[PDB]
Amino acid sequence: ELSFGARAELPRIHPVASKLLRLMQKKETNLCLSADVSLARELLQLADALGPSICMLKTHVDILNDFTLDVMKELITLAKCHEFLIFEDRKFADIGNTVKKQYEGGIFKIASWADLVNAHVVPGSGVVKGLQEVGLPLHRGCLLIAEMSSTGSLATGDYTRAAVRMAEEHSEFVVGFISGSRVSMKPEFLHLTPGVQLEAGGDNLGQQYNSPQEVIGKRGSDIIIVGRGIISAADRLEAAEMYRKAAWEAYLSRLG
């Protein structure tokens, strides 16, 4: 097993994955903040304060009540300053012809500001082909959703294997997975795991939680994605530091 810094140099590494792995190693963080807020001011204040603690800030642009492209310009300034990627968790899941337009155009112009997006594999590989026709020219990366944290997820067995094959066949654009575990044996691919809290539990709408030690240490994932475990805490900076230290030590203990 290689360090994040060594994985950043692998021959087949995607440039977006390399940039991410280098700043993970530099900053000792494998934490992705899930910035699940409705106010631009709260999004930007979290990005500024937690920027030094995170490798990535994950957005849902479509729940921002006061979205503008100028908000995303301000988020990019903070991403550059503090060194983290922006990941829009849009979960593209339509035919290729439609997702290309949803990625490039409309009000959000996601491809203009998002380093990473993700896609469901259920429509077949046309979803990746459509996205990559916008994303490749804009030097972007994509994550495929191989496993899901929610109760009743159908992303198991042959479905997960299909996601891994689709990723490994589109490595010019696909840089990794949303998964609960290591699903690819190829170290060029990133594994990002949501459904993470320090305490056991879930929510009222099918979310299930596992700890950073479980998902990074035992299940072999790379990055934890944490929303409410940080966002709902009073001191979001201290909460981010507790999640960062948990995920980082779990990673170190698997390296030996």
Ligand X SMILES: O=C(O)c1cc(=O)[nH]c(=O)n1[C@@H]1O[C@H](COP(=O)(O)O)[C@@H](O)[C@H]1O
CB of 47 closer than 8 Å to CB of 240: no
- 178 binds, options ligand X, a copy of itself, none, Cβ within 5 to 8 A by partner type: ligand X
Is the CB of residue 56 less than 8 Å from the CB of residue 20?
yes
Contact 178, 145 (CB under 8 A): yes
The one catalytic residue among 91, 109, 129, 245: 91
Beta bridge partners of 87: 58, 116
Active site residue 94: yes
Say whether residue 129 binds a copy of itself (CB under 8 A): yes
Q: Is 249 in the site for ligand X (CB under 6 A)?
A: no
Q: Is position 27 annotated as part of the catalytic site?
A: no
Task: Note whether 228 binds ligand X by CB under 6 A.
Answer: yes
Beta bridge partners of 192: 178, 223
Q: Which of 21, 40, 146, 155 binds a copy of itself (CB under 8 A)?
A: 155
38 binds a copy of itself (CB under 8 A): yes
Interacting residues of 96 by C-beta distance below 8 A, sequence separation 6+: 123, 126, 127, 128, 129, 130, 131, 133
Half-sphere exposure of 138 (CA within 13 A, CB side): 20
Closer by beta carbon to ligand X, 34 or else 132: 34
Q: Which of 94, 214, 241, 249 binds a copy of itself (CB under 8 A)?
A: 94
Residue 237's binding partner, choosing from a copy of itself, ligand X, none, with beta-carbon cut-off 5 to 8 A by kind? none
Q: Which of these, 52, 76, 80, 31, lies nearest to 192 by C-alpha position?
A: 31
Does the footprint of ligand X cover residue 141 (CB under 6 A)?
no
| Cα–Cα distances in angstroms (integers) from residue 57 to residues 38, 187, 237, 249, in the given order | 15, 22, 14, 20
**Contact map string, positions 85 to 104, toward ligand X, x by CB under 6 A:** ----x----xx--x------
Give the catalytic positions in this structure: 89, 91, 94
**Residues lying near a copy of itself in the complex (CB under 8 A):** 36, 38, 60-65, 67, 89, 91, 93-98, 100-102, 105-108, 120-127, 129-130, 133, 145, 148-155, 159, 162, 203-207
